[PDB]
Amino acid sequence: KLKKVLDKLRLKRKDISEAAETVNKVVERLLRRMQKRESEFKGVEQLNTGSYYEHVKISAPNEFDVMFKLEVPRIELQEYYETGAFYLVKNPLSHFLEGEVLSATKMLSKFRKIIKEEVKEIKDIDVSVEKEKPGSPAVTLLIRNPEEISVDIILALESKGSWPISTKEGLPIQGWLGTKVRTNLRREPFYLVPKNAKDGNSFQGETWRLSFSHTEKYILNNHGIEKTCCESSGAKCCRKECLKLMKYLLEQLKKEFQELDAFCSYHVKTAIFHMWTQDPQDSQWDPRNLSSCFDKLLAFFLECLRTEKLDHYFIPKFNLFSQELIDRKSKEFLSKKIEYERNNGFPIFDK
Amino acid sequence: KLKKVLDKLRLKRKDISEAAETVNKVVERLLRRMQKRESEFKGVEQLNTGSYYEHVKISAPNEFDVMFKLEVPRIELQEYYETGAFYLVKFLSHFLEGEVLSATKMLSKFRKIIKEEVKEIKDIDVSVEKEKPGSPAVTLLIRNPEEISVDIILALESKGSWPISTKEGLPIQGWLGTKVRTNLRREPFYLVPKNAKQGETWRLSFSHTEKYILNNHGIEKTCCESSGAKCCRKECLKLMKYLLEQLKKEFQELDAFCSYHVKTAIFHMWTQDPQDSQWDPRNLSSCFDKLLAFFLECLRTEKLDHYFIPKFNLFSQELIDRKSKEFLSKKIEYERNNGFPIFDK
DNA sequence: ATCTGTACATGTACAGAT
DNA sequence: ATCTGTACATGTACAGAT
DNA sequence: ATCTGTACATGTACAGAT
DNA sequence: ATCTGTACATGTACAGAT
Ligand SMILES: Nc1ncnc2c1ncn2[C@@H]1O[C@H](COP(=O)(O)CP(=O)(O)OP(=O)(O)O)[C@@H](O)[C@H]1O
Ligand SMILES: Nc1ncnc2c1ncn2[C@@H]1O[C@H](COP(=O)(O)CP(=O)(O)OP(=O)(O)O)[C@@H](O)[C@H]1O
Ligand SMILES: [Mn+2]
Ligand SMILES: [Mn+2]
Ligand SMILES: [Mn+2]
Ligand SMILES: [Mn+2]
Numbered sequence A: 001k002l003k004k005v006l007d008k009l010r011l012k013r014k015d016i017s018e019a020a021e022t023v024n025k026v027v028e029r030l031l032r033r034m035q036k037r038e039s040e041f042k043g044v045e046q047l048n049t050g051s052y053y054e055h056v057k058i059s060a061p062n063e064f065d066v067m068f069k070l071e072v073p074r075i076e077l078q079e080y081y082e083t084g085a086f087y088l089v090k091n092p093l094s095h096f097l098e099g100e101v102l103s104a105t106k107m108l109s110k111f112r113k114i115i116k117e118e119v120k121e122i123k124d125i126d127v128s129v130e131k132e133k134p135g136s137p138a139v140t141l142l143i144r145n146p147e148e149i150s151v152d153i154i155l156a157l158e159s160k161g162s163w164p165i166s167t168k169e170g171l172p173i174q175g176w177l178g179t180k181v182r183t184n185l186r187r188e189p190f191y192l193v194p195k196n197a198k199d200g201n202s203f204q205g206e207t208w209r210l211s212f213s214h215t216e217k218y219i220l221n222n223h224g225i226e227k228t229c230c231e232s233s234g235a236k237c238c239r240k241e242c243l244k245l246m247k248y249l250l251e252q253l254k255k256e257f258q259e260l261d262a263f264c265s266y267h268v269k270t271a272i273f274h275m276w277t278q279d280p281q282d283s284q285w286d287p288r289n290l291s292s293c294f295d296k297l298l299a300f301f302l303e304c305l306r307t308e309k310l311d312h313y314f315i316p317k318f319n320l321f322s323q324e325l326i327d328r329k330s331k332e333f334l335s336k337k338i339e340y341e342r343n344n345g346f347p348i349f350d351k
Numbered sequence B: 001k002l003k004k005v006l007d008k009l010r011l012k013r014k015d016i017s018e019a020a021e022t023v024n025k026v027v028e029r030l031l032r033r034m035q036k037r038e039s040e041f042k043g044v045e046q047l048n049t050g051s052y053y054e055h056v057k058i059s060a061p062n063e064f065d066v067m068f069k070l071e072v073p074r075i076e077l078q079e080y081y082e083t084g085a086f087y088l089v090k091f092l093s094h095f096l097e098g099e100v101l102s103a104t105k106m107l108s109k110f111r112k113i114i115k116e117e118v119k120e121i122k123d124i125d126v127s128v129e130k131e132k133p134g135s136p137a138v139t140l141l142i143r144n145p146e147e148i149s150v151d152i153i154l155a156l157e158s159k160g161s162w163p164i165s166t167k168e169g170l171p172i173q174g175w176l177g178t179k180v181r182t183n184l185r186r187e188p189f190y191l192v193p194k195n196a197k198q199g200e201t202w203r204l205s206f207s208h209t210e211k212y213i214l215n216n217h218g219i220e221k222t223c224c225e226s227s228g229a230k231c232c233r234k235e236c237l238k239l240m241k242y243l244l245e246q247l248k249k250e251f252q253e254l255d256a257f258c259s260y261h262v263k264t265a266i267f268h269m270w271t272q273d274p275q276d277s278q279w280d281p282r283n284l285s286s287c288f289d290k291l292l293a294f295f296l297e298c299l300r301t302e303k304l305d306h307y308f309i310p311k312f313n314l315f316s317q318e319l320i321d322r323k324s325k326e327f328l329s330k331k332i333e334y335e336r337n338n339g340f341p342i343f344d345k
Numbered sequence C, D, E, F: 001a002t003c004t005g006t007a008c009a010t011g012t013a014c015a016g017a018t
């Protein structure tokens, strides 16, 4: 029943194969262009992230996320007004500086210009660059070989120092993945992507946001308290399956209802990270109990909506569901929709 | 009772501190000599190994193992007979015996250098132990004034795929898992100048892999961590090591046995019984008793396969006589059936 | 002659197809 | 249950640069 | 190239709580 | 007796400086 829904959401190998071949060609060509001698982005490296590379993409392989990450040694960070997530950042990049402050907007604008130039010279493939969207750190490619595929090329600064202080009590995996895992994860770099809002606030053009997309990918692919969870000599859990179901519920509601424009799949991802922390035992995600596991995720998400509280998993003081970011009305609208589907056998899964 | 024995075997923080301070001085000075000096071993790097660095040393901090590992440009290995563990090495040109990199020549120069440097140490009472023909180590004897031995082990580091003899080894797939096993086998492998029984042959070492396993020994990621549950795996290893050590002190008949037999056996047992709840501290007695039963079965079948190299039998007749295994069997069974009176010594 | 940034070589987990 | 395409970590060969 | 600084894992040690 | 919290000690991966 839920299993039949998962059957419908499963990607097909033929679609995967055809989509990846084209995405890989485009991305490699753009990455090579970035290495040309006079490029401010020479030395940028690729990191594939997001649902496709975590194996939780649903319905079709039609949206791919790729970070083009540039190491920026000897950075000093200044927190933007105690928000925990947003920072000012203070030589190939000297053209993007205003005094000692690195402009996210100048740097993103040049990045976009280079990508557009290279895209125009692709005659192989039907590909174009989507109009910039406010609040996005990405240059998005629209590929039509024939099926529509979007690729988000995300500009990111790489810093190898210790993670900012706002993350100190974040990543609360000690009871689940453990202390050695958390220590090792926090020794990896952290990333900053352009905030890129057009909201008339101070430093609009120069504000960067923390990204832990690499850490999140690791977690999704190494998600059990037991080392053998979902391995060929261990037991299958239903953690990724619950994430896929919850993502589908949101995707379906969002297609129908403009009232839900403020919500995105990262809200669901964040909520399930909290549930995986609350219920760390693999036996609490037994496949035989798929319905009750999905049901408890739903109940948890409803509580987050109704109490207006969903803390960023890495930055606990940052509340993704504050009234400042999302209206009461929107949260209540979504709450009623979720409770309806839950209590009437998920008719939206049949559409 | 077993817990009281463990209390006696526990190292004291003050002894640890005093022993490590002296060991670290001597080791650092030898490692530095191997460098800025125009030695064939320039670029050798330190890797601490064995029971002290795995936190399973018992009784006193009086025996330390250190590898001085040298990366060597793509070598070619030829298995010695079909021993699995021993190899001739081809492509430091000073250490060739017509094209083969001689374990004896290379170890001899290494040992010469260490001896020379040791003679110039004036602040610490340290000497080099007479060479043992079976040993890949240059062994130091420190009087601190307590007696401390340090094994400085020369090792070639190779970054290639592990040799074919290890293909079915490291059988951790059901315990630590496939990602762990794959990642482990992506690390280098080591060759130490332990001769086959000759002079040119080298032997495989996985001391780095063994150390990782002892530090990451649970099916659960949180085993023995501050937000997980304590298991009794290392405590059973300590107890079994002490039983062998005590029997070996009393009976010369047991000279062919060593702690690495016990280590190998418990690796096998941890693979057979992977679940952390099968090693609950409340069940220390049962756990130690099943380790004993397992070891007795290894003795009775004359079979103890190297954990990494399955065709290498540490209990073959060629290495250990039938009578020696039977002698040990009887001793172990006596201690087991009389409540371990040797633990009270 | 050597050095090297770039891309191929090797190996296998994950999960879809049969 | 087996077979099989993709992703990806790490080793290494080498055209072009020095 | 080498070396120090940081962070926190692994331990010992012991009082107070359970 | 064990568990839990704090203090005190060593080992170790790796960034950044030199
Ligand atoms: N607001 C945010 N805060 C932190 N990280 C974010 C974020 N938005 C996106 N990300 C990161 O960037 C990745 C890609 O984002 P999206 O493409 O928008 C979604 P997704 O996780 O890939 O699933 P989907 O594309 O199937 O909906 C996320 O997986 C997450 O790691
Ligand atoms: N026969 C062998 N084969 C492979 N590796 C061996 C070996 N003998 C010793 N080693 C490696 O070298 C390490 C140190 O060896 P030893 O000092 O002889 C023992 P130990 O494991 O340190 O315990 P112990 O010194 O408390 O008795 C071992 O732990 C192992 O990793
Ligand atoms: Mn995505
Ligand atoms: Mn995206
Ligand atoms: Mn030792
Ligand atoms: Mn030794």
Ligand SMILES: [Zn+2]
Pocket: A223, A224, A229, A230, A235, A236, A237, A238, A239
């Ligand atoms: Zn799982």
Ligand SMILES: [Zn+2]
Pocket: B217, B218, B223, B224, B229, B230, B231, B232, B233
């Ligand atoms: Zn444990």
